[PDB]
Design a protein around this ligand. Structure first.
Ligand SMILES: CCCCCCCCCCC[C@@H](O)CC(=O)N[C@H]1[C@@H](OP(=O)(O)O)O[C@H](CO)[C@@H](O)[C@@H]1OC(=O)C[C@H](O)CCCCCCCCCCC
Ligand SMILES: *[C@@H]1O[C@H](CO)[C@@H](O[C@@H]2O[C@H](CO)[C@@H](O)[C@H](O)[C@H]2NC(C)=O)[C@H](O)[C@H]1NC(C)=O
Length: 246
């Protein structure tokens, strides 16, 4: 399991949690020095438990699929909650079985569905450590519309930061003041599958992407990534989605 406490949290302790989260995900190989997530994991081992504590010490446990860093559901006191998707119903076979009741949320976990439920696109939702304290608080008691926006904050401040060093640094900058994600952040989120795939295909193509990936940079400018020498690959990306899962 891994844990993070918002009480006393600072850029350093958040970085330690993001490091713990990455190091909890199993891999057999690195590709271009980036951990390659496994094609498949059977049974309860598929799921990582993240214990998150809000500023007041109240807690939820979040179940993450270790092959793809996707959140499946979470436990809040005696109630479990899962996305309305088959991978999450599958997870509910293994985690939080001891919950008194299980609620299936009225959306899947993908960004488009969650933005619809929340009434707002990600571009308009501030993120940061205060926002994560709020999301934990919101998830403690069911409210499906509030929970969709809480889950957009939770996904970006845990899974997305685990996948990209740039996104982890953006959250660190927001340790004490929330701010909507930078356009580069949204770009990286959206490109993780693309990138993971192109980095894997470069292995027999001399480091060259079969298909270039378009990103927005830190300055708001629209760069084109063509090969493994890009900073996005040498410095930023930290986990690769296996191409078996793409
Ligand atoms: C009876 C009916 C049966 C069932 C109901 C349905 C089945 C629905 C399955 C949805 C599964 C979903 O949870 C997996 C997923 O996708 N997750 C998002 C993200 O996972 P997190 O927990 O968010 O890490 O992992 C990704 C990491 O960033 C993130 O992108 C994901 O969300 C999406 O992909 C949603 C939209 O597809 C993207 C929204 C942006 C729109 C702009 C296009 C993106 C640019 C693509 C590059 C050209
Ligand atoms: C591999 O990647 C780098 C991009 O990071 C490319 O080098 C760039 O080349 C373009 C050519 O238009 C320039 O605009 C950039 O200024 C260069 N940047 C750096 C850091 O070198 C390179 O073109 C790519 N190589 C291959 C073989 O496709």
């Amino acid at each position: 399991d891994v844990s993070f406490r918002l009480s006393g949290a600072d850029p350093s302790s958040y970085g330690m949690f993001i490091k713990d989260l990455r190091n909890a995900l199993p891999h057999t190989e690195k590709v271009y020095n980036i951990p390659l997530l496994l094609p498949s994991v059977s049974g309860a081992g598929r799921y990582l438990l993240m214990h998150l504590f809000n500023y007041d010490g109240n807690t939820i446990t979040v179940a993450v699929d270790v092959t793809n860093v996707y959140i499946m559901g979470y436990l809040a006191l005696t109630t479990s909650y899962f996305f309305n998707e088959p991978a999450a119903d599958l997870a509910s076979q293994y985690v939080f079985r001891s919950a008194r009741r299980k609620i299936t949320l009225p959306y899947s976990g993908n960004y488009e569905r969650l933005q619809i439920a929340a009434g707002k696109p990600r571009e308009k939702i501030p993120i940061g450590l205060p926002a994560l304290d709020t999301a934990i608080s919101t998830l403690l008691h069911y409210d499906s519309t509030a929970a969709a926006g809480a889950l957009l904050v939770l996904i970006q401040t845990t899974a997305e930061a685990a996948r990209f060093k740039y996104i982890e640094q953006q959250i660190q900058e927001r340790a004490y003041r929330d701010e909507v994600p930078s356009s580069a952040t949204i770009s990286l989120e959206n490109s993780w599958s693309g990138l993971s795939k192109q980095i894997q295909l470069a292995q027999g193509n001399n480091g060259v992407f079969r298909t270039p990936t378009v990103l927005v940079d830190s300055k708001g400018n629209r760069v084109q990534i063509t090969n493994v020498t890009s900073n996005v690959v040498t410095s930023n990306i930290q986990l690769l989605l296996n191409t078996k899962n793409i």
